[PDB]
Design a binder for this molecule. Structure first.
Ligand SMILES: *[C@](O)(C(=O)NC1CC1)[C@H](CCC)NC(=O)[C@@H]1[C@H]2CCC[C@H]2CN1C(=O)[C@@H](NC(=O)[C@@H](NC(=O)c1cnccn1)C1CCCCC1)C(C)(C)C
Ligand SMILES: *[C@](O)(C(=O)NC1CC1)[C@H](CCC)NC(=O)[C@@H]1[C@H]2CCC[C@H]2CN1C(=O)[C@@H](NC(=O)[C@@H](NC(=O)c1cnccn1)C1CCCCC1)C(C)(C)C
Lengths: 306, 306
């Protein structure tokens, strides 16, 4: 038993990280096959950040302006293209450590593991969730951009995020592996507001099941509710509205514990209006929303990976 | 910026995990060089657990009673010895992926990363601390024993824990890599109490510095205290007493922020007696004690690994 913020093993990703340099800027790139992907602002100088014309900037850059390294090994750039906000650097040497991967774009509420790196070298791994406002609350310092977020499906690494920037509020934003930002952000140094954030209701319910699985059942009650009646209370506390789909995804956890999802919603409803009254759930004094139903099943069922 | 429960990249450890079988028992082993280390209770049957005589049990076992696998690859056991509560299986094939390692025994309050595995396959990675009562609050299921805890020092993996069992309270216990349990536990199925647990004061102070580094400074005050006066309040709230050594280890964080350790103790003192009054620090409503001063520096300074 037990329950922790568990991340995916990062072995498969560690072997794809490289160091990319252009001018005085050094950041990380993702080396898969014979391509190195990295944030396109790597070609900008501090003066260009205000209002960059990436197309024109890229046109003035030649393959030898890009120094790419993989430890000692220096890769040779054969070509450079730009896809959305991501830069693709064709290289002479293909990556032998290229795992079986794919690029996916996650949705708000879904979670993934982040391999924070600096100078192409791994620093740590942690789990986090894509917030409803499309930002993430990560832990990144200068030099971290190019670090990626990923998930694993047995033997397939799914890359879903590349780090690009930080907001004054302390949160982070980036794109998927096709270069499209998550959220309304653009890569230029201007004030850009992230929408209001909300609590990922489905995740909170999953965590509550996890607690029950782990013997913490004090918050359980005999009352019941309807999806409509629950949502009315939820929206008042800035919680995402719960949909029938959410209910279906929580089915497995409901099956395993014998507690209907609406019965669980009824307990959550009470907790929102009455608070936790000095008690904790799974060691926390706040309702945790960064565990998906799948994360709970995986951790409580012991799903492993090739 | 940002602050998360960060674990070490597990690449180097993933390649040392193997599956060990003996009779109807299958668990994980650690394959380094030509030795596979695993919990010695792998030779026991359910009936032997009550009061096992490991020496006699081991004597009745022959090298071919141990099936060891590394994916498809089947290793061949050439010999079997027992060191304390750990079993050493000499093998015909040495591990090519054997990293530059060493075995260390940590102290209460120190943290490490755990690579949870099942059937020799990795499941996830998470950070945790050795509690003052020598247990750990991990996340492990049946089949998890042999999973290890480790740290990394540039290019050297330091193994400091091997999982053996779980207490009814839900916490976990195991040994170091030389087979000595952490705590007063013995590997037999009998009631065995873990001592009273306490809060790792030095860690809490480190986390407070982390918060300051991250802009959360509301709890700061102009008062000051003495180590003796602080400790008197601390012991009342079941906090470990703070020693001059602790103070010295917190020096780097004090240097970086310009806040004396005793000034920080004075803020913590107030928080203990007055509470957080509906506020949070680094997103938490409780004082976190599973981050060492080093963990804070590493995460706030961006230390990486070969
Ligand atoms: C990343 O490229 C990296 O690791 N580089 C290595 C060190 C050399 C780097 C990581 C910084 C911690 N990211 C950036 O430099 C991005 C790039 C890409 C988009 C613009 C520039 C600036 N930048 C930032 O992360 C900055 N943040 C901002 O510029 C935000 N600005 C404001 O909040 C703002 C702007 N004008 C007026 C008032 N406020 C913007 C906000 C909108 C979304 C994009 C980021 C810093 C300050 C470096 C964190
Ligand atoms: C591990 O070997 C594994 O992953 N095996 C794979 C599935 C085949 C396994 C993991 C279990 C979740 N560990 C154990 O089986 C250990 C071994 C080693 C020491 C004794 C046996 C039993 N065991 C346990 O983890 C059990 N826990 C206990 O036996 C605890 N007992 C009590 O609390 C107790 C005992 N008698 C009366 C009342 N209470 C003892 C407590 C003292 C310290 C050692 C553990 C289970 C119940 C399987 C978790």
């Amino acid at each position: 038993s037990g329950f922790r913020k568990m991340a995916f093993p990062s072995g498969k990703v560690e072997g794809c990280m490289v160091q990319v340099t252009c001018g005085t800027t050094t950041l990380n790139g993702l080396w898969l096959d014979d391509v190195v992907y990295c944030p396109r602002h790597v070609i900008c100088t501090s003066e260009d950040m205000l209002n960059p014309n990436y197309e024109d900037l890229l046109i003035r850059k030649s393959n030898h302006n890009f120094l790419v390294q993989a430890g000692n090994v220096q890769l040779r750039v054969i070509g450079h293209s730009m896809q959305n906000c991501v830069l693709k650097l064709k290289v002479d040497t293909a990556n032998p450590k290229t795992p079986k991967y794919k690029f996916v774009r996650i949705q708000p509420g879904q979670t993934f593991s982040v391999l924070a790196c600096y100078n192409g070298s791994p620093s740590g791994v942690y789990q986090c969730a894509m917030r409803p406002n499309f930002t993430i609350k990560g832990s990144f310092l200068n030099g971290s951009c190019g670090s990626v977020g990923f998930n694993i499906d047995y033997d397939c690494v799914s890359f879903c995020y590349m780090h690009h920037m930080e907001l004054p509020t302390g949160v982070h934003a980036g794109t998927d592996l096709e270069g499209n930002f998550y959220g309304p952000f653009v890569d230029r140094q201007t004030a850009q507001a992230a929408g209001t954030d909300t609590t990922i209701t489905v995740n909170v319910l999953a965590w509550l099941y996890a607690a029950v699985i782990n013997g913490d059942r004090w918050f359980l009650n005999r009352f019941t509710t309807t999806l409509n009646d629950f949502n009315l209370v939820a929206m008042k506390y800035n919680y995402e509205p719960l949909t029938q789909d959410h209910v279906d995804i929580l089915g497995p956890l409901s099956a395993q514990t014998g507690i209907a999802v609406l019965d669980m919603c009824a307990s959550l409803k009470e907790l929102l209006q009455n608070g936790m009254n000095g008690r904790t759930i799974l060691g926390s004094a706040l309702l945790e929303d960064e565990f998906t139903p799948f994360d709970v099943v995986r951790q409580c069922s012991g799903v492993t990976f090739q």
